[PDB]
A and B are shown apart, each in its own frame.
Chain A
């Protein structure tokens, strides 16, 4: 039965209307609820039973539900409305189901590309029979990045661990990626690169054995 599907991301200018949709097979015959969740905070109900509003919720939040689509509309979107939004329903088969969430951005800072710093394994770690290449990614906005490694232009999937972006202390984001090899592997290619792509374009740093 029951998957509910939302778009990962929606953007609005301040004062523009945001619309977040939530789709499911005859979702129109369930009672849809909507939750807003800010970073590090519990979800808060903003609409229940398709279109009703708890007291305390600003009148700009409204809801709709017909056919395969339910929609949460925010008119005159404000800065504080920036959050993840989840749609939710109940049905006999799967009980309480939630959509995957939709991050809403109110165009809030200017774009900033990532700084990428890439460190080769240390002589200390190579003496201890290991090697880690460390790729540090900072000062970006908005907060999504795609990182990739190459061993002399040849792609690598083996041995790569990458964090998800976390909001900084100046309203931009940081992440890191680590590529773990053996010393022989590390000597066995003539160079290595983390290639970081930020909505738009690709930044690259490269390192070579010594």
Chain B
């Protein structure tokens, strides 16, 4: 079975550097052109760099030329991408992808790894501000009601949200975060509950952010 396993991705700041590697197995690594191809979240595919079977030829996308360097170790079945002078727009999943054959003209990918995520951001680590999203009027009395928590301006991902310490999970919708222009994230978590429950029952959202060692409870009231 052809296998390509990439690693070394992670968070890093613009201007900084990172080295990715890809360990290959299940084919004769030495006789194929190998590529790096990247995918920005929710975007299409962009070829980055490729290297001939014998390391006689190396090619780069113009977006990346002069900052990335590709190399291979035929003795260890391993491919490297040294990425320098990182920019925010280099943020993407990076796939290692075997070419069809050995030479540049054969460089179209046939097999791809699962890829490694590279997040390039200048944001500093920051715990969220947690605000209540009070239930207002939407459905009615003897109906259901929606209330929530706004988790504003944190970095990096991820944040965990529970309600009443994990005791309330039914009716909970926690939405994927928005990445703002500030480079900071925000998300929301809403719970739907009986309207008649408002002001006899209490609803506290618990917001956990490991990076900033932040643990915040917020009581959400009418």
Contact = CB atoms under 8 A, between A and B. Distances in A.
Interface in B116-158: 129, 131-134, 136, 138, 146, 148, 150, 152
Is chain B's interface secondary structure helix, strand, loop, or mixed overall?
strand
A125 interface: yes
The number of chain B residues touching the other chain, given as a range, is: 35 or more
B110 A45 contact: yes
Contact of B44 (A45, A101, A117, A132): A101
Given A134-B188, A178-B178, A178-B186, A95 B131 contact: no
A125 to B, nearest CB: 5
Interface residues of A, number: 45
Is chain A's interface secondary structure helix, strand, loop, or mixed overall?
strand
Contact of B175 (A121, A125, A163): A163
A42 B95 contact: yes
B111 interface: yes
Given A42-B95, A43-B45, A100-B44, A124 B131 contact: yes
Given A33-B108, A134-B188, A122 B131 contact: yes
Given A42-B95, A117-B190, A96 B178 contact: no
Contacts of A125: 129, 131, 150, 152
Given A95-B104, A98-B45, A161-B178, A45 B132 contact: no
Interface of A: 31, 33, 35, 41-45, 48-49, 54, 86, 88-90, 95-101, 117, 119-122, 124-125, 128, 132, 134, 136, 138, 161-164, 166, 174-178, 180
Interface of B: 35, 37, 42, 44-47, 50, 59, 61, 95, 100, 104-105, 107-115, 129, 131-134, 136, 138, 146, 148, 150, 152, 173, 175-181, 186-188, 190
